[PDB]
Chain A
């Protein structure tokens, strides 16, 4: 019976963290309609270019074309147009043997751990 009450408690605690993850997933899905959207996308593209020294190709969406063409005329890059990405950009390095994706859903899913610690500590 004590395992019954404790497992009911921890699964009820887990699904609320799941729905907080749902809220932030939708509030990051509805980010490309905002006036600071080329600012945040070119900031993330600058970080992705920064972590990979001297990229060659930069993969972005057909919707993500016009907001960052000033990046596509400096730093030696050449842009590639592909709708494979939902968020963020990609940096193709030396000979296609290295990519650095900097999509937003990937940033959430990778950084979720210590942020989940702080989310549970903030909510309790």
Chain B
């Protein structure tokens, strides 16, 4: 019974570990793509303020 409960709790918490680990990591992937898209889409409309500034400060 000691070996059986050891093996059963092992398989139980490794199922738990596997499922919750992949459910966490895919959600972090989703939120990471959302954050990258959000900062790029905020920067695109924000652009062309920059290029005139850098071309003004490089040129005399």
Contact = CB atoms under 8 A, between A and B. Distances in A.
Would A and B touch once assembled, by the CB under 8 A criterion? yes
B53 interface: yes
Interface string B21-32: 000110011011
Contact-residue size bin, chain B (C-beta under 8 Å from the other chain): 20 to 34
Interface residues of A, number: 29
A8 B36 contact: yes
B2 interface: no
A24 B40 contact: no
Contact of A4 (B32, B53, B60): B32
B24 A1 contact: yes
Contacts of B51: 20, 23-24, 27
Contact of B60 (A1, A27, A43): A43
B32 A24 contact: no
Interface of B: 24-25, 28-29, 31-33, 35-37, 39-40, 43-44, 46-51, 53-55, 57-60
12 contacts: A1-B25, A8-B36, A12-B37, A12-B40, A43-B60, A44-B60, A104-B58, A111-B58, A115-B58, A119-B50, A123-B43, A124-B46
Interface of A: 1-2, 4-5, 8-9, 11-13, 16, 20, 23-24, 27-28, 40, 43-44, 47, 104, 107-108, 111, 115, 118-119, 122-124
Nearest to A22: B51
Contacts of A16: 40, 43-44, 47
